[PDB]
Amino acid sequence: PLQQTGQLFGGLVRDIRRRYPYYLSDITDAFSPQVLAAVIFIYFAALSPAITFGGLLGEKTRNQMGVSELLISTAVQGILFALLGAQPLLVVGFSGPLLVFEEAFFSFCETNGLEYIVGRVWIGFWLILLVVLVVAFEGSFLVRFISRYTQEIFSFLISLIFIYETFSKLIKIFQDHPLQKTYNYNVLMVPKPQGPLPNTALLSLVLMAGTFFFAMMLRKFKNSSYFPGKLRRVIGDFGVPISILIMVLVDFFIQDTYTQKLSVPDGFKVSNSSARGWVIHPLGLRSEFPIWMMFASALPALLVFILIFLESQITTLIVSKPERKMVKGSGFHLDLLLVVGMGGVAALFGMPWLSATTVRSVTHANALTVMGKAQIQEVKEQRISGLLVAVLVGLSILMEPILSRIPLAVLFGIFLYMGVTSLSGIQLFDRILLLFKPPKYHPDVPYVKRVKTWRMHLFTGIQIICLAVLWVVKSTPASLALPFVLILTVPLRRVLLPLIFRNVELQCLDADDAKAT
């Protein structure tokens, strides 16, 4: 699959031939209750980050791109990717690095007196050209170089960032409405509370903890022995929706306490009508775009391409692992082409460019996964789940009355649950846990038995140092260099690590799949 065919666009046609014959099976496998449960869960997990990043992006870019644009982009791109994608299980949405790049580009354009939206259009054109060139030469074959080392480092970092962001949101809620002896009861509540409120912080904390605990308990009940088998599994599949419903109703019955709720724009309207229209003009919105700027937009296009390529391809590698029991097969060349080309086309309309997200995609895959009598029996691989998630995200603007009832604390707890669950499949997390377990309690696995405990611990420590460096770079102002450090981890594995460690130990610890040799 990843190997170069040697012919122009060979990988893309190979992926098409490999995946599209199973198109009828993709629709047929969707008709199941687990599919509906995954649809609801991933719909919430994709809608909430869309709104959060839309708000942040509208704040940073002066509403040039806002919540409505991001929601429409997510809906359209998800629909198209599910319909025509080699790996339908991936969920395309905005991520933190993209927001950082967008704000940096906005600041640069402000400094240089250029139109931000037109610069984005030209970056999108350059991205389309670059992705066409890459897919032509089967540049996705380079994904083979990315080892389990980099995959697990990236997944662990993403999960840690997710958990830390959830806790940071909780800290922000507490700081906005601190527990104080005296409050003011004339506080304006529009657009947001203008002062501290009583019971808001503790109520939000209680709601988040309750939803997290309910989701975890239902997850345990899924594989437990209580109740019949089929009914137990059916209830467990709907665990997250049930927890969300329980906590939403609990908050709803509480009427004298204020808690923040999901907010969606009234209608499908451009965020800043004065600043932009629905369709951007590449030549110029109000003034002539510079020739030098349109020619130099290639470099920002290169940075965005690195971001999207790294994220999407690593997500594809994680989801398509042999342990996941994926059998239909994913296409690296088709997925990258679709994602980057759609991002470039959206840039023309002024919508953001989206990339497959690690946590959303992993949660989508695990939600469809069915586990037989601690082993993954099968994964319900189909296109309808992601298609319906994208359709609902697009319809979220119309579903204002239902959405406004859901507190943000419930979703924060759900996101903590998502991070914790996504930490399961990483071997780096398992070795981090083994750091605490005494040696005798270590499991019987190829790397535990064939590696001296101290050497394996040194391996995990080096990975932890890499994670710490990546986190420091992410926090530092030059957060856009994170993809380059992630790439640099590959030379660390291929060159530096062999000097410290013997070949056999590297083979056991950094195995491609969960198998011996």
Added chain:
Amino acid sequence: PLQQTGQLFGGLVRDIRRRYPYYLSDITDAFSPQVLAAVIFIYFAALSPAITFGGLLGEKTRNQMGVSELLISTAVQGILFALLGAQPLLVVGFSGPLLVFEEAFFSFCETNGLEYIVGRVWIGFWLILLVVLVVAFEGSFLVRFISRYTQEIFSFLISLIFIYETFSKLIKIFQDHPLQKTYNYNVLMVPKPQGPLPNTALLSLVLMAGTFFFAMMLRKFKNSSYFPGKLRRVIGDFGVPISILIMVLVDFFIQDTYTQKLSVPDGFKVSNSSARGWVIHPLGLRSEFPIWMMFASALPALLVFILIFLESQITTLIVSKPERKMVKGSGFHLDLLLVVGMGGVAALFGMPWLSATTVRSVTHANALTVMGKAQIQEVKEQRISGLLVAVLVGLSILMEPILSRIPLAVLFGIFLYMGVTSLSGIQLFDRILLLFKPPKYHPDVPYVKRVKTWRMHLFTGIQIICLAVLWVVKSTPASLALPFVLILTVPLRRVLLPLIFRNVELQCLDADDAKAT
């Protein structure tokens, strides 16, 4: 040991003979960190209910019996019972039915124009006479008739009462300080808040949930593989103290929110100085005790003896079961005599009559229990744990500055945890769980393989009906007759059940111990 020796006071002498030789080993066994952890845990578990019941009794008795009297009685009774008791594991304290009887007798006295404390003293005289007569006749042999049926029904009822009372106290906290849009800050803060306060109800809920969660997680931590062996066991033993410290610190660092704190009397004085003195004269403080009343106190004293004897003997049965691995052993005759005689002594001084609590006794047993790496390897039997707990309870007034820092929410969570852990060892709870499990998942136990599933479920349903009847009796104002209804289960087991169940089914279901049947 239950069989009558044929000589008056033979059982008492046999018990003291059996228990005296280990006395030297009892003090030696106390030297271990587990002992200190159990001391702290049981100290909190005994102190908090003592204050609760003392305050409630003072409210009901117009200060004729308050917190100081209960604290002194509990302290002295614990010291004496630990010094001379056949079962040091039992924890002597005040339980609900004693409170109910005290209030009922107060109402009866007010109806008949009698002094409550003097009637209590005469009842104590009659109770001492009753216990002396019973021990003389070896009446403790009737305890052998108490089978697993009544024992487990009583334990399940007490644990359910613990959980229900904790949740009812939480509901009371939420009712006193409801979540409302607007509060008033002119509310007077002494003696207690005179109106709703912000963040108090939610903060109490959060503290209770946090302490319960930390206690459960530290329980899981002891049996898990994390951290070294000895270190992990040491942490696990101190689990409840550690959770209490964590939540107390969390509350302490929060400054602008009020949570009900532990209230210990400043000095050792009678609750109502004018009403009564330290020593109650039998003929009455204010008026002569009617001769007819001192003669009729035999009936209320008879009821009190029935109740206290039932509670203490059943608790001794629970603690001294063969599965508990109580190697040194204990005697029913001696501990009953000590408990009842000391209750009468307390009645003479005016303090109440204390009986060994079920949940506290079971929790002190479990705290001292040492489990091999799934089973009870042994149980530590020391006279120093109970003695130290009693000494600390007596020292509570002297430790007011630290004890006043402990919120009631932490102790409510600790009591919920205590009930939950008490539910562990009851086979009635196991069969209640089995009701939900499918037949294939049922464990390999004598009453599962030997007994048809539907007959076992019928047995469980009959026990549940008995529990429901006991609960209804406890709620209805006939709660004082609850021990009578509890003892009615013995005729049920010896008469009614054999009609429906073959002998083999009863042998399997109601096995006295975990042995071949």
